[PDB]
Every structure is written in structure tokens, then in C-alpha cells.
């Protein structure tokens, strides 16, 4: 079990598994019971997030692709960038987080190296 | 300040 770890979503603990059988490596969260599911495409994931063993809180997150071809402010008068859609997850182990954090990155660079 | 309870990872291009 390398590219797959039990990740939490919406307060529920499911199963995070990277679909490396398709063109663009994806990330599919399949609940433990099978009542909750979620899909994530690393192709859009601009950045990755993971709480190292140094962090008492074990939780992972992925930054999705936004759009820097519009630009705007925060309604106050500060030119900022549209918040990128990210998927926040929660892990319950030190090794589990490493399984995804170390595996996801494998897909991350998969786009940078090519791009 | 969500960095104290979360670390950063290799992000896309910037500079």
C-alpha cells in the first residue's frame, strides 16, 4: 500500500487512493464503509500539503489550479489572486501521512518535469 | 497563520 492511505473527508474517515491507471494521475477518496466518495485530479493540483511528523496535527491538503488571467481585489482595495480550490484532508498517523505525502509528490512533479 | 499547524510543499512555478 504505497499510493493509497486512509484519509478523512468531511469529518469522516475514508480511503485515499491515487489512480495511476489513467492519463492524468488522480486521487480518489473511497470511504471505509462505502457511503462517502471524492475525486481529485493531481493534474489540477498546483501544490501539495502535508503535516510532517513535527506537527502534532496530522492533516493533508492539496491546492487546486486557479486562474491568474483575471486578477482582482478583496473588496477593500488590495490586488490579490483568486483563492485556489483545495481539498483539505485529515490523517491519523505518522506513517500514513508519509504514504500520501511521499506518493502524491510523485504525481506533482509528474507535471512539472513534463511542463 | 495556518503555517504553525501545517507545513508547505513543493509548489508550482513562481520565480
Swiss-Prot record, chain A:
What protein family does this chain belong to? Belongs to the TFB1 family.
Report disulfide bridges, numbered on this chain. none
Q: Say which residues of the entire protein are included here.
A: 2 to 115 of 642
Query: The organism sits in which domain of life?
Result: Eukaryota
Q: Return the protein name.
A: General transcription and DNA repair factor IIH subunit TFB1
Organism classification: Eukaryota, Fungi, Dikarya, Ascomycota, Saccharomycotina
Compartments where located: Nucleus
Chain residue ranges for the region called Disordered: 65-85
**Which residue intervals are annotated with compositional bias (Basic and acidic residues) in the record?**
65-76
User: How does this chain assemble?
Assistant: Component of the 7-subunit TFIIH core complex composed of XPB/SSL2, XPD/RAD3, SSL1, TFB1, TFB2, TFB4 and TFB5, which is active in NER. The core complex associates with the 3-subunit CTD-kinase module TFIIK composed of CCL1, KIN28 and TFB3 to form the 10-subunit holoenzyme (holo-TFIIH) active in transcription. An additionnal subunit, TFB6, plays a role in the dissociation of the SSL2 helicase from TFIIH after transcription initiation. TFB1 interacts with XPC/RAD4. XPC/RAD4 recruits TFIIH to the NER machinery. Interacts with the NER 3'-endonuclease XPG/RAD2.
Q: What task does this protein carry out? A: Component of the general transcription and DNA repair factor IIH (TFIIH) core complex, which is involved in general and transcription-coupled nucleotide excision repair (NER) of damaged DNA and, when complexed to TFIIK, in RNA transcription by RNA polymerase II. In NER, TFIIH acts by opening DNA around the lesion to allow the excision of the damaged oligonucleotide and its replacement by a new DNA fragment. In transcription, TFIIH has an essential role in transcription initiation.
Miscellaneous comment text of the record = Present with 5150 molecules/cell in log phase SD medium.
Q: Which organism is it from?
A: Saccharomyces cerevisiae (strain ATCC 204508 / S288c)
UniProtKB/Swiss-Prot annotation, chain B:
Name residues in a coiled coil: none
Tell me where in or outside the cell this protein is found: Cytoplasm; Nucleus
Domain of life, per lineage? Eukaryota
What extra comment accompanies this record? Present with 876 molecules/cell in log phase SD medium.
Spell out the family assignment given in the record's similarity comment: Belongs to the XPC family.
What task does this protein carry out? Involved in nucleotide excision repair of DNA damaged with UV light, bulky adducts, or cross-linking agents.
> What name does UniProt use for this protein?
DNA repair protein RAD4
List the source organism: Saccharomyces cerevisiae (strain ATCC 204508 / S288c) (Baker's yeast)
Gene behind this protein: RAD4
Entire-sequence positions represented here: 90 to 104 of 754
Amino acid at each position: 500500500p504505497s499510493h493509497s492511505g486512509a484519509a478523512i473527508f468531511e469529518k469522516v474517515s475514508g480511503i485515499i487512493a491515487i489512480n495511476e491507471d489513467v492519463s492524468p494521475a488522480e486521487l480518489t477518496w473511497r470511504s471505509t464503509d462505502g457511503d462517502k466518495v471524492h475525486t481529485v485530479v493531481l493534474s489540477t493540483i498546483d501544490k501539495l500539503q502535508a503535516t510532517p511528523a513535527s506537527s502534532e496535527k496530522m492533516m493533508l491538503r492539496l491546492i487546486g489550479k486557479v486562474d491568474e488571467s483575471k486578477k482582482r481585489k478583496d473588496n477593500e482595495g488590495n490586488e490579490v489572486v483568486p483563492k485556489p480550490q483545495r481539498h483539505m484532508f485529515s490523517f491519523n498517523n505518522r506513517t500514513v501521512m508519509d504514504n500520501i505525502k511521499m506518493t502524491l509528490q510523485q504525481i506533482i512533479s509528474r507535471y512539472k518535469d513534463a511542463d | 497563520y495556518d503555517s504553525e499547524e501545517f507545513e508547505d510543499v513543493t509548489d508550482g512555478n513562481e520565480v
